Amino acid sequence: GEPKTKPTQSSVRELRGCGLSPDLIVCRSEKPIGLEVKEKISNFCHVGPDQVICIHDLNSIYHVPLLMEQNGVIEYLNERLQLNIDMSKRTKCLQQWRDLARRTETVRREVCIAVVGKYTKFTDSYASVVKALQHAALAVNRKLELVFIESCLLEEETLHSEPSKYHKEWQKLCDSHGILVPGGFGS
Amino acid sequence: GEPKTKPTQSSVRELRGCGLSPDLIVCRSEKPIGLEVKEKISNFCHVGPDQVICIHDLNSIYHVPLLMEQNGVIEYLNERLQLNIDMSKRTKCLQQWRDLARRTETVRREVCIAVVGKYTKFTDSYASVVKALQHAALAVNRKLELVFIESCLLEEETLHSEPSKYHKEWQKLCDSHGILVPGGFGS
- DSSP secondary structure letters along A85-132: ---SSBSB--HHHHHHHTTGGG----EE-B-B-SSSS--SSSTTHHHH
Q: How far is the CA of A169 from the CAs of A113, A158, B158, B164, in angstroms?
A: 12, 12, 18, 10
What angle is formed at CA A32 by the lines to CA A31 and CA A36, rounded to 5 degrees? 130
Closest approach of B27 to chain A, Cα-based (Å): 46
Which residues does chain A have within 8 Å of residue B166's beta carbon, measured at their own beta carbons? Answer: 174
Q: What does this entry list as its resolution, in Å?
A: 9.6
Residues found in chain A: 187
Side chain identity at residue B54, one-letter code: C
Distance from CA of B167 to the nearest CA of A (A): 6
CA atoms within 13 A on the CB side of B20: 9
- A155: distance to nearest CA of chain B, Å? 15
Largest CA distance in chain B: 69
* A chain contacts of residue B164, beta-carbon cutoff 8 Å: 171-172, 174-175
**Backbone phi, then psi, for A114, in 5-degree steps?**
-105, 130
For an interface test with A, the pick among B174, B176, B179 (most A C-beta atoms closer than 10 Å) comes out as B174
Chain A positions in Cβ-Cβ contact with residue B168 (cut-off 8 Å): 171
Experimental approach taken = cryo-EM
Q: Do B170 and A172 touch (CB under 8 A)?
A: no
Amino acid at B14: E
Distance from CA of A144 to the nearest CA of B (A): 18
CB-side exposure of A35: number of CA atoms within 13 Å? 4
Measured between CB atoms, which of B162, B163, B171 is closest to A167?
B171
In three state form, how does the secondary structure of chain B look?
CCCCCCHHHHHHHHHHCCCCCCCCCCCCECCCCCCCCHHHHHHHHCCCHHHCCCCECCCCCCCCHHHHCCCCCCCHHHHHHCCCCCCCCECECCHHHHHHHHCCCCCCCCEECECECCCCCCCCCCCCHHHHHHHHCCCCCCCEECCCECCCCCCHHHHCCCCCCHHHHHHHHCCCCCECCCCCCCC
